[PDB]
Amino acid sequence: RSTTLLALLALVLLYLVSGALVFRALEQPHEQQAQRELGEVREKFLRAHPCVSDQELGLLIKEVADALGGGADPETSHSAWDLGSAFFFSGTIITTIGYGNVALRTDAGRLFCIFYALVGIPLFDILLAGVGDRLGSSLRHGIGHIEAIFLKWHVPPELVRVLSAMLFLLIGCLLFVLTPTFVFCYMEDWSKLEAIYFVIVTLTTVGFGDYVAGADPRQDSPAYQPLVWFWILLGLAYFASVLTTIGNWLRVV
Amino acid sequence: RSTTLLALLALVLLYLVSGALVFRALEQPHEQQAQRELGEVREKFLRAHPCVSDQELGLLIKEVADALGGGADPETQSSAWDLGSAFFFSGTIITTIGYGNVALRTDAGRLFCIFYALVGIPLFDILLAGVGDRLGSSLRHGIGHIEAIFLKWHVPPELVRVLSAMLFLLIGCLLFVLTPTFVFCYMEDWSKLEAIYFVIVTLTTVGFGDYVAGADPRQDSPAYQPLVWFWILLGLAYFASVLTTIGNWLR
């Protein structure tokens, strides 16, 4: 087991060095895009507004950056610490997703966020394991109806345990990995790829924050942000049931 | 139990509503001031440059915001995927910290990052549980030598288990909380609070990405950023290992 652990360490190290080579190869050529776009914006603004020196448009951007840095939104609601978005932010902590698309400015908020997390995350892990067992119980009994169909067609009952486990991961993959992506695709105006990326980045609790649903109160479909809160709970709980049986079989073998 | 399950859901709901009230109370005044400051900057710039409509200066800020959002630096006019930082980025995925201080531009990178995570995270959870059981054995085994002295001086054996467990968490807290915060405090030029914040946000794997060690454009510290990950491994395994031994002595 000592020998295996380092074999597994060396595997993971080569898995990261391999990842590092790939991401570099794909992403390094498009490092400079954002900066080129900012410069392209400056140069067009100067060409269009001649009473503006390059250096004066320089200080504007730095001052604009500092306001955006302090949490300002380009105005053309937007409040990201209204009770809705603050509730959402609190949720990104206890879920350990931590998008960071809206970051804390105050030392008070950072100090608070520490104790909020240390009490909140484990409190949530108990509810997650609780909803994980409950939703999994309901679902495996629900498949018990389709298991009855396969038993009457005289199929070996251990093949039915695999077919049920396959249906178990596909029925919830339909409800938590496909349904949301098609929802987000239309609601957020993302591409089908951008949507699946967000969904998986979220449910893995990696939560980069490059893409966020947001939980900002709006209309056109006011029943959207309420169902996005609810989805992450159910989706994370759905993973847990799966990743414990995959994790249980990989550590015993 | 369905009764306890719903009581737990109401508890967590009030825990988030309570968090929401607090964060708003602490953060929102700063945010709304920042908004006033943006508007103050616009109004000041219009008054200085009359060849610019309000609405045209509107689009500039939107476009400038979006470029800054994409990671453009206000300071220059013109590597975050050097082998060091790309290795680090890969580390933020399998650890499920996911700082996201440098995010992926290509569809290729995002599609790859999906399969990289679905394979990587559980592969790491096995190493974490492996180092966790190993690291926990070594400390409880190692302290057992120093624990022996206190048992012979006739402190009740249930209370020496607590004293050992206290020393066990304080030696680990020293090595994987206090040591790193004092390190980052000097290395990154953060405040002692900013450092503890980062450390805890990292080890909780919340990984906001507002603060990232080795991110600094200036630093030519090649071993530093990967070597921070050596800490992250040990810290997360300790964070895991101690909370699971806590779980055994509870249940």
Epitope: - | G39, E40, E43, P50, C51, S53, Q55, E56, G58
Partner: antibody, heavy 116, light 107 residues
Framework: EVQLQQSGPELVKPGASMKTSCKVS????????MNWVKQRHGKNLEWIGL????????TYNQKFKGKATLTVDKSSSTAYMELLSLTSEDSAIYYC?????????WGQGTTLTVSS | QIVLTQSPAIMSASPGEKVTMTCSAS?????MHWYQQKSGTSPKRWIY???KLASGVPARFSGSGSGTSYSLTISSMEAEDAATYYC?????????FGAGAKLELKR
């Protein structure tokens, strides 16, 4: 001495369109934003829209979006406003005025009369 | 469309009287501007950036305020001060005006 000189008063049939003009002087036409304001039988002043005569950029009051079309002629340093499918409600005084925060110099005004 | 409210819409003063007309904004505003219009003629910028006098404007006129509540004040009413005063705002697009305050002479 800065001066906005509007075209005379126009009288058009209901349903027809109207174009009125405003020639600036004492400054650089292209150097400042031109606005148009409606004052309706001497009551509260309505900002119709602005044009950046240098860029040709136009934003309108959502109320006037379909009615008004602002254009300039850089060469003659003249701003134009065109009102479309006119109703008796459009009979007003219309001012071109200069500014990007305060309307510092105004034209003499032009009086539109929609009437059969 | 920030609402400016000039109440009362009509007011009178004997010459030598202090006049103070006011303009309240539906939401906060960084600076208020004021126009003087005399019947027959277009408006003329009177006070801009809240308390700044446009060139012709005599010293007896004065502006002040902040937030949602601004005021144009004449220390000592004159005959030639009798006109309509409008408050304007361009702290948010679109810019908007008051109803106007019509100031008549008292005799």
């Amino acid at each position: 001495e800065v001066q906005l000189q509007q075209s005379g008063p126009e009288l058009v049939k209901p349903g027809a369109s109207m174009k009125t003009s405003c020639k600036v002087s004492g400054y650089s036409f292209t150097g400042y934003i031109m606005n148009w304001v409606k004052q309706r039988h001497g009551k509260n002043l309505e900002w119709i829209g602005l044009i950046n005569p240098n860029t040709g950029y136009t934003t309108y009051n959502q109320k006037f979006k379909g009615k008004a079309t602002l254009t300039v002629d850089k060469s003659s340093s003249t701003a134009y406003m065109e009102l479309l499918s006119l109703t008796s409600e459009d009979s007003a005084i219309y001012y071109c005025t200069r500014g990007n925060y305060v309307f510092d110099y105004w034209g003499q005004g032009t009086t539109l009369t929609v009437s059969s | 469309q920030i609402v400016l409210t000039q109440s009362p819409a009509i007011m009178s003063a004997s010459p030598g009287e202090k006049v103070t007309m006011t303009c309240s904004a539906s939401s906060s505003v960084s600076y208020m501007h004021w126009y003087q219009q005399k019947s027959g003629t277009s408006p003329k910028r009177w006070i801009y950036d809240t308390s700044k006098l446009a060139s012709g404007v005599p010293a007896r006129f004065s502006g002040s305020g902040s937030g949602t509540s601004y005021s144009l004040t004449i220390s000592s009413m004159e005959a030639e001060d009798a006109a309509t005063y409008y408050c304007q705002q361009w702290s948010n697009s679109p810019p908007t005006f008051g109803a106007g305050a019509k100031l008549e002479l008292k005799r």
